[PDB]
Design a protein that fits this description.
Oligomer: part of a larger assembly
Helix content of chain A: 55-70%
Number of strands of chain A: 0
Number of strands of chain B: 11
Radius of gyration of chain B: 16 Å
Strand content of chain A: under 5%
Strand content of chain B: 25-35%
Order of helices and strands of chain B: EEEHEHEHEHEHEEEE
Structural class of chain B: alpha/beta
Largest sheet of chain A: none
Number of helices of chain A: 2
Order of helices and strands of chain A: HH
Helix content of chain B: 25-40%
Shape of chain B: globular
Largest sheet of chain B: 9 strands, mixed
Chain lengths: ~50, ~210, ~150, ~45
């Protein structure tokens, strides 16, 4: 019972920065995924009309 | 939905009077008495439901800013600050601590030559941060600066026309005063470089047509 | 640090035009071109750049062989006057006296002065004449400055 | 056991995401409560 409560609290805390750091770096994560591959859709570059 | 406010000069066109909350407008006046008279007339010219604040320097604001008994809002939230740059630097946080600033008008009456010591770069940064905060919290800021030789500062303000939403000046000419409206951006359109003459009759700024 | 040029072909954008008029905060400048049979009336409600802000200007342009040329009413207000106090003078005008104010900018001859004045809008340009040979080039420079930088100069 | 640990994990994740999303709200409420006006002191609501 006591040990159960302790482990519960530990998990709670660790997942606070897990969800706090996920949101903080959220904008940067999308950026990184984009250049990896993401999906350049809709607008398509025609060509370099020199 | 957010209400628009009016400047404190009578017999003036609505194109140059209305300030939609959510921006920064700037005013210069030649003398301190002109600054205080304009501030009092702005306070007396507001709608009842509007929320207006006044920030003053080097004085007790309860004794220099008045209210008309016939028109204007029921009450105003006077403020006070040290005659220092740190007061302007902290203005945003200080006002956030004591007031929710959403849909508010802030009149900032500085002292004589108060804005003389603020460097150009920090003034640019202050204007940028004030514009961003105004857009974020949907508040309007009016700045009234009694000064003499702010030509460099006025050019600085003109260069920052993106931060500001309107810049005007008031110059003493003996019997009348000259209003130079550099630009103005409100709900009814945008103006550019007018010159208008305004007089002070019984302490009330009335435009002479 | 990128610029966008929105070109909107439309006929009944009156509501859209009013919305764009209200949308100052997201638009540096709103410009409208109206075809009127033989010429195009250019109606710029407001426009902003590094040289100031212009508002409520109506101009006339015509399409000649596919080119857009402004009509000879090229004396329309140069609304912004931000250098109304700047004095651009040849160094010889001040006969060795120190510049009177911070507004005085000195130039060595009347060719650097012309180059700097091609960018001004309301400044005072003071040329110096010391020989009769430099009257025709000075006349040409003055003509170019007057025909391009408007009447406020 | 591990199952309830993972349940709590899920809970605290969007819970911590919503708390982060209300960063501005939290900041404003805290400023209103603690209330440190360092230089600008409200003189008083005038009538």
């Amino acid at each position: 019972i006591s040990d159960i409560i302790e482990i519960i609290v530990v998990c709670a805390l660790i997942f606070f920065p897990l969800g706090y750091l996920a949101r903080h770096s959220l904008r940067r994560i999308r950026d990184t995924l984009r250049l990896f591959f993401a999906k350049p859709r809709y607008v398509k570059p025609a060509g370099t009309l020199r | 939905v957010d209400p628009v406010f009016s400047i404190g000069i009578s017999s003036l066109w609505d194109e140059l009077r209305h300030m939609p909350a959510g921006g920064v407008w700037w005013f210069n006046v030649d003398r301190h008495e002109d600054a205080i008279s304009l501030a009092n007339q702005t306070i007396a010219s507001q709608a009842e439901t509007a929320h207006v604040a006044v920030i003053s320097m080097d004085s007790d604001p309860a004794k220099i800013f008045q209210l008309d008994d016939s028109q204007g809002p029921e009450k105003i939230k006077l403020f006070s600050m040290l005659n220092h740059e740190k007061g302007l630097y902290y203005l945003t946080r200080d006002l956030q601590c004591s007031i929710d600033p959403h849909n508010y008008l802030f009149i900032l009456v500085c002292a004589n030559n108060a804005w003389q010591n603020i460097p150009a770069e920090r003034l640019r940064s202050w204007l940028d941060k004030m514009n961003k905060w105004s857009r974020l919290n949907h508040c309007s800021l009016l700045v009234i600066n009694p000064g003499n030789n702010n030509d460099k500062q006025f050019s600085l303000l003109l260069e920052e026309y993106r931060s500001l939403f309107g810049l005007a000046s008031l110059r003493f000419q003996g019997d009348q005063h000259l209003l130079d409206i550099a630009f103005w951006c409100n709900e009814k359109g945008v103006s550019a470089r007018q010159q208008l003459s305004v007089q002070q009759q019984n302490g009330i700024w009335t435009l002479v047509q | 640090h990128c610029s966008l040029l929105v070109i909107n072909p439309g006929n009944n954008n009156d509501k859209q035009f009013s919305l764009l008029l209200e949308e100052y905060r997201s638009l540096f400048g709103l410009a409208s071109l109206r075809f009127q049979g033989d010429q195009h009336l250019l109606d710029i409600a407001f426009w902003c750049n590094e040289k100031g802000v212009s508002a409520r200007q109506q101009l006339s342009v015509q399409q000649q062989n596919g080119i857009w040329t402004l009509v000879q009413s090229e004396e329309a207000e140069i609304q912004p006057r931000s250098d109304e106090k700047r004095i651009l003078s040849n160094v010889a005008v001040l006969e060795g006296a120190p510049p009177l104010s911070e507004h005085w900018q000195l130039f060595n001859n009347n060719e650097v002065l012309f180059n700097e004045a091609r960018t001004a809008q309301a400044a005072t340009v003071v040329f110096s004449l010391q020989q009769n040979a430099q009257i025709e080039p000075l006349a040409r420079s003055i003509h170019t400055l007057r025909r391009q930088r408007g009447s406020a100069m």
